[PDB]
Amino acid sequence: MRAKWRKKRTRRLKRKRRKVRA
Amino acid sequence: NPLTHSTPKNFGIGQAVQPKRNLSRYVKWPEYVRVQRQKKILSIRLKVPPTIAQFQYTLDRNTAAETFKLFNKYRPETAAEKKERLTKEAAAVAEGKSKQDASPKPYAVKYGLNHVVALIENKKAKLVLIANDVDPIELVVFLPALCKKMGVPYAIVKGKARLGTLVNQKTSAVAALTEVRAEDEAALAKLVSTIDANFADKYDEVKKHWGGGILGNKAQAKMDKRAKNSDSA
Amino acid sequence: GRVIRNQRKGAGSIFTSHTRLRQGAAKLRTLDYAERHGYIRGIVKQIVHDSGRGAPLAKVVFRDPYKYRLREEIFIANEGVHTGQFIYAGKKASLNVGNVLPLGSVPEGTIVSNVEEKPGDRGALARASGNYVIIIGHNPDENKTRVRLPSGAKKVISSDARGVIGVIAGGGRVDKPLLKAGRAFHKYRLKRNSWPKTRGVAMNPVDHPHGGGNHQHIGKASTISRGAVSGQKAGLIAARRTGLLRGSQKT
Amino acid sequence: RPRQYATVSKTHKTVSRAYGGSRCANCVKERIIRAFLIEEQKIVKKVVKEQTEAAK
RNA sequence: UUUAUGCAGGCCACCAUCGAAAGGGAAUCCGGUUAAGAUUCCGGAACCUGGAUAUGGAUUCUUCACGGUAACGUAACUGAA
RNA sequence: GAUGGGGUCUUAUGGCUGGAAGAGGCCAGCACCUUUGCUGGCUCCGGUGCGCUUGUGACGGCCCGUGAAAAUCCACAGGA
RNA sequence: ACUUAUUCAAUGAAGCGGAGCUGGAAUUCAUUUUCCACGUUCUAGCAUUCAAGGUCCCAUUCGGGGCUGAUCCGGGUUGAA
Ligand SMILES: [Mg+2]
Ligand SMILES: [Mg+2]
Ligand SMILES: [Mg+2]
Ligand SMILES: [Mg+2]
Ligand SMILES: [Mg+2]
Ligand SMILES: [Mg+2]
Ligand SMILES: [Mg+2]
Ligand SMILES: [Mg+2]
Ligand SMILES: [Mg+2]
Ligand SMILES: [Mg+2]
Ligand SMILES: [Mg+2]
Ligand SMILES: [Mg+2]
Ligand SMILES: [Mg+2]
Ligand SMILES: [Mg+2]
Ligand SMILES: [Mg+2]
Ligand SMILES: [Mg+2]
Ligand SMILES: [Mg+2]
Ligand SMILES: [Mg+2]
Ligand SMILES: [Zn+2]
């Protein structure tokens, strides 16, 4: 882990900024 | 300016990690690169018999430029111009019934190995250009001696690809002017007066000289270091 | 007749060396640039025991000069090397116990070990416990050093060859009796299947040249020609002499 | 066990020092001391080897 | 953000695969239940992995926490190659 | 840098609480073709040990024997 | 004797050869013949982000690029035989 964990972290942050873009 | 500092790194032997340098001298190349380099190395480490390196004295770039400028005036007809030519000749034999002679007589450079060899044997060639990079060299090693025997002038020139672009091919490996127009026959004469001096008149002395036998850089430095070692007096 | 035991040894089915508990091949550092133009410093992190080997090993850590990383070489530990010690390997290295100076840069009488035959094979000579190579002399012209080997032989190797300064640790091992087939068993159990050994004279003639007879006896002479063939070389191969060695051997 | 360290927080796996969960406190102390001391020694070696051959 | 995923880049040099139902290894227990099944079904109570994610809490105007001399502590208290 | 005085930590393990008494167990009484139940109580407090088995810890002995590897997971340095 | 055939060995083919700087010795018999060097040795630390700096451009801005830092030339990876 820590690698898929970092990738999940960046995926969640990218989804958060992409949905708050609007 | 007061926030920056000069670190400079000690790139000594045990001091710091070396920077990225140009390691092109130490690249492990593929075998095709290695063979295509070591082949030309081996072709000069050996004493080549004079029939080879009767090549390797090529035409200088000025005379090569002017002779290709001459040869480009006499270029074989491409497919499109040949097609409109033959349609014109069909129309001409339809209207006038001319014996396929409405089209004028061609003036084109003759090419193809067997073709120009037969032309040389029949003494119809006025000037022959022989490419220097033929990969079986035995396709053309006999051509200079044959040209000297038949008395036709030859020139060993750089680029079978250049001859190929001259005759609308990829490579041609040989070219020959067999009949020129009166507008530049004098240019052909002043050109051949230097070409024969470069090749034909130097033929019986290049026939005796063995080329090759050239050492590498490290071995050359080693032998001349031994020379200036023996030069104590 | 059958295929005899020493003839079977070369197939390497059950006669391979048991290499499960070995730390790796104990080689010298590669002669890259630093070792032949200056020196480089490593550190002995741990001195460990190697299975099937009488001499202890030393895990020396160097820095890679071209990439940011750490390289770990396995040296054979010389007698006196301790943990935390700085090992200096190179042409400009100082003459101390544990350093890997080339043999061209050491004076006569220097005691070295793990010596290269040709520069770049990373240690071939004097690697057993307690052994060492003496430097007899140099030849600057025709750059060769003459050395005395543990066998008493005198070799002439390149002065660019390297060697660890000192004596291989673990010396005096064979001065202790094993006292026991069990101890010999446990010694060979981690080297290879070469123990116990049945005498060929106690076998049958299908099994050995010496086998057979109503008494245990060899029969023919036990000295075998060097030009003999496999299956015949059972005995003293190409013996120049035999019997008890009295007097000096005229070495 | 090594997989269980993925479930606990950072407090259970570290202390609040440099080389926290990696090195001992005394080991951190002695390597700090070694760093500072021999960098000072490197400075004084630099200035003395400079000034000797600057004079000569 | 014609848009697909090329071109922008950047990192990386192991270098197939098979090989343990006793080696290594993420995580489950109790009670009950059938003619014959159970750490597998029923009831209750948990745990791990993977993925989505919002709220609370924590932290910040001294931007990425404080306390303890210290060993260290805590609910958290960015960290790529 | 002992003993001593004061603290820090690993939580194997053990204790209390939750889980959880509602479960399970032991009894009593009331019952009825019957599915058969239903209703009550009690389930508490200790002690011992060169004991047996097993796990673990700190040690000590033995070796020319020093007694697997990888996957996997975490942490640290660094400062993008 | 040579090296290019052949053969041996290593490396993630990284520093080969020649010349040149900058120092030391060097005797120079005119002006320099050469020869040695040409960043690391009390200490179980650290050393990585095309490298900081200097300099020159861009169009300044968020930065970007070149040279030097780190001497040139030969592309023979390096030896042995
Ligand atoms: Mg055996
Ligand atoms: Mg026996
Ligand atoms: Mg018998
Ligand atoms: Mg027999
Ligand atoms: Mg017999
Ligand atoms: Mg008998
Ligand atoms: Mg902690
Ligand atoms: Mg498998
Ligand atoms: Mg398994
Ligand atoms: Mg298992
Ligand atoms: Mg195991
Ligand atoms: Mg059953
Ligand atoms: Mg269930
Ligand atoms: Mg807090
Ligand atoms: Mg105390
Ligand atoms: Mg527990
Ligand atoms: Mg048992
Ligand atoms: Mg190499
Ligand atoms: Zn420690």
Curated annotation (Swiss-Prot), chain B:
One example of a Gene Ontology biological process annotation: cytoplasmic translation
Localisation per UniProt entry: Cytoplasm
UniProt superkingdom: Eukaryota
InterPro entries given in the database record: eL8/uL1-like, Ribosomal_eL30-like_sf, Ribosomal_eL8-like_CS, Ribosomal_eL8/eL30/eS12/Gad45, Ribosomal_eL8/Nhp2, Ribosomal_eL8_euk
A molecular-function term among this protein's GO annotations: RNA binding
Annotated Gene Ontology cellular component terms: cytosol; cytosolic large ribosomal subunit
Record's keyword terms, sorted: Cytoplasm, Ribonucleoprotein, Ribosomal protein
Protein task: Component of the ribosome, a large ribonucleoprotein complex responsible for the synthesis of proteins in the cell. The small ribosomal subunit (SSU) binds messenger RNAs (mRNAs) and translates the encoded message by selecting cognate aminoacyl-transfer RNA (tRNA) molecules. The large subunit (LSU) contains the ribosomal catalytic site termed the peptidyl transferase center (PTC), which catalyzes the formation of peptide bonds, thereby polymerizing the amino acids delivered by tRNAs into a polypeptide chain.
Assembly description: Component of the large ribosomal subunit (LSU). Mature yeast ribosomes consist of a small (40S) and a large (60S) subunit. The 40S small subunit contains 1 molecule of ribosomal RNA (18S rRNA) and 33 different proteins (encoded by 57 genes). The large 60S subunit contains 3 rRNA molecules (25S, 5.8S and 5S rRNA) and 46 different proteins (encoded by 81 genes).
Additional notes on this entry: Present with 238000 molecules/cell in log phase SD medium.
Family classification: Belongs to the eukaryotic ribosomal protein eL8 family.
Protein name, UniProt field: Large ribosomal subunit protein eL8A
Organism: Saccharomyces cerevisiae (strain ATCC 204508 / S288c) (Baker's yeast)
Curated annotation (Swiss-Prot), chain C:
Primary site of residence: cytoplasm
Domain of life: Eukaryota
Record's keyword annotation contains Ubl conjugation: yes
Intracellular or extracellular location(s): Cytoplasm
GO process annotations (BP): cytoplasmic translation; maintenance of translational fidelity; ribosomal large subunit biogenesis
UniProt GO MF annotations: RNA binding; rRNA binding; structural constituent of ribosome
Any one Gene Ontology cellular component term annotated for this protein: cytosol
SMART domains associated with the record: Ribosomal_L2, Ribosomal_L2_C
Modified residues (Phosphoserine): 51, 94, 158-159, 248
Entry keywords, A to Z: Cytoplasm, Isopeptide bond, Phosphoprotein, Ribonucleoprotein, Ribosomal protein, RNA-binding, rRNA-binding, Ubl conjugation
Residues in cross-link Glycyl lysine isopeptide (Lys-Gly) (interchain with G-Cter in ubiquitin): 45, 92, 118, 144
Pfam families listed in its UniProt record: Ribosomal_L2 (PF00181), Ribosomal_L2_C (PF03947)
Known partners and oligomeric status: Component of the large ribosomal subunit (LSU). Mature yeast ribosomes consist of a small (40S) and a large (60S) subunit. The 40S small subunit contains 1 molecule of ribosomal RNA (18S rRNA) and 33 different proteins (encoded by 57 genes). The large 60S subunit contains 3 rRNA molecules (25S, 5.8S and 5S rRNA) and 46 different proteins (encoded by 81 genes).
Family: Belongs to the universal ribosomal protein uL2 family.
Note: There are 2 genes for uL2 in yeast.
Biological role: Component of the ribosome, a large ribonucleoprotein complex responsible for the synthesis of proteins in the cell. The small ribosomal subunit (SSU) binds messenger RNAs (mRNAs) and translates the encoded message by selecting cognate aminoacyl-transfer RNA (tRNA) molecules. The large subunit (LSU) contains the ribosomal catalytic site termed the peptidyl transferase center (PTC), which catalyzes the formation of peptide bonds, thereby polymerizing the amino acids delivered by tRNAs into a polypeptide chain.
Name of the protein described by the UniProt record: Large ribosomal subunit protein uL2A
Curated annotation (Swiss-Prot), chain D:
Compartments reported by the entry: Cytoplasm
Signal peptide bounds: none
MF (Gene Ontology): structural constituent of ribosome
Domain of life per record: Eukaryota
Keyword vocabulary terms for this entry: Cytoplasm, Ribonucleoprotein, Ribosomal protein
UniProt-listed GO biological process terms: cytoplasmic translation; ribosome biogenesis
GO cellular component, one term: cytosolic large ribosomal subunit
Protein family according to the UniProt entry: Belongs to the eukaryotic ribosomal protein eL34 family.
Biological role stated in the UniProt entry: Component of the ribosome, a large ribonucleoprotein complex responsible for the synthesis of proteins in the cell. The small ribosomal subunit (SSU) binds messenger RNAs (mRNAs) and translates the encoded message by selecting cognate aminoacyl-transfer RNA (tRNA) molecules. The large subunit (LSU) contains the ribosomal catalytic site termed the peptidyl transferase center (PTC), which catalyzes the formation of peptide bonds, thereby polymerizing the amino acids delivered by tRNAs into a polypeptide chain.
Binding partners and assembly: Component of the large ribosomal subunit (LSU). Mature yeast ribosomes consist of a small (40S) and a large (60S) subunit. The 40S small subunit contains 1 molecule of ribosomal RNA (18S rRNA) and 33 different proteins (encoded by 57 genes). The large 60S subunit contains 3 rRNA molecules (25S, 5.8S and 5S rRNA) and 46 different proteins (encoded by 81 genes).
Miscellaneous: Present with 23600 molecules/cell in log phase SD medium. There are 2 genes for eL34 in yeast.
Name under which the protein is recorded: Large ribosomal subunit protein eL34A
UniProt organism field: Saccharomyces cerevisiae (strain ATCC 204508 / S288c)
Interval of the full protein contained in this chain: 58 to 113 of 121
